[PDB]
Amino acid sequence: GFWEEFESLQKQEVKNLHQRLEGQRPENKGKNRYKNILPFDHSRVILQGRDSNIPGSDYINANYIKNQLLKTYIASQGCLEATVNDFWQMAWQENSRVIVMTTREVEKGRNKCVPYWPEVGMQRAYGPYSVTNCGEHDTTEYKLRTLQVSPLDNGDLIREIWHYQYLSWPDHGVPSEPGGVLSFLDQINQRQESLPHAGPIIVHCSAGIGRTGTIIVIDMLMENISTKGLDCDIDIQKTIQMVRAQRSGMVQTEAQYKFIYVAIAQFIETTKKKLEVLQ
């Protein structure tokens, strides 16, 4: 009786998998970069520590993404000034220890993301959290900032968060070679794997679907390969569709689509050459 009746209610939620009502509350209008790029209600990140008596207080334009054909991710839009505190609430509650920013703050005179970290050696509050930038390391393609975050009501409860910003991947194109992105993801994965208890990796660009979707799909495919071997079914189209069921529009452009193929092809060839050496 019960499970059959329950299944009859599971039906409605299946059909509702494409709704994006929360992002359309009038209270949330200033929290979106684009009125038409909204998180699916079913997978949206719901902010805690907020007053449920205030409509929209739980909102952020971001969704959980998991590899439903295999670690997990959050795909987020890039901060507006009005949403920087919301971003830090999200990172704290999810226990995220790695942030992956795939955009510059401004590209070609267009705002993409406001900075939500302090300069090195600076400490400041973002709502009820204190964030300190403890140091930076520059490579040719990306910058790593080590942030220390703690609740203002619990000052000694410190978490280190590693913030990786890719600097050479414009919203209007893709990198000329995939090597930079592949080594960037290798460092990110080494960091994440070193922390079994860490929450989802937070990945963002400007709208949170283009470069964000592209880098997440590359990472999931690399994971699949590293786990199953070079024998595995690599189905890029299927992987993208799976990720699109969780946040609308992930992997936006034809250049991004081709870049996934180019990145994975190089990853496979590099892997094969190393294995050839070991045998």
Number of structural domains, the chain? 1
- What is the secondary structure of 149-189 as a DSSP string? EEETTSTT--EEEEEEEE-S--TTS--SSSHHHHHHHHHHH
What sign has the CA pseudo-torsion 238, 37, 165, 147?
A: negative
- What is the secondary structure of 1-47 as a DSSP string? -HHHHHHHHHHHHHHGGG---GGGSGGGGGG-S-TT----GGGBPPP
113 is in an annotated binding site: no
Domain limits for position 91: 1-279
206 is in an annotated binding site: yes
Alpha-carbon span 125 to 14, nearest angstrom:
40
Q: Is 205 a catalytic residue?
A: yes
Contact 42, 17 (CB under 8 A): yes
Q: Which of 79, 113, 134, 205 is catalytic?
A: 205
- CATH number for 171: 3.90.190.10
Number of neighbouring beta carbons within 10 Å of residue 9: 8
- CA nearest neighbour of 162 among 134, 139, 181: 134
179 is in an annotated binding site: no
Burial 22-32 (b: 16+ CB within 10 A, else e): bbeeeebeebb
- CA nearest neighbour of 59 among 101, 90, 14, 34: 90
Alpha-carbon span 123 to 234, nearest angstrom:
45
Alpha-carbon span 52 to 7, nearest angstrom:
29
Alpha-carbon span 220 to 226, nearest angstrom:
10
Number of neighbouring beta carbons within 10 Å of residue 137: 9
Q: Chain-centre distance of CA 91, in angstroms?
A: 11
Please name the method used to determine this structure. Answer: X-ray
Pairing status of strand 142-151 against strand 159-166 = antiparallel
3-state SS class at 68: coil
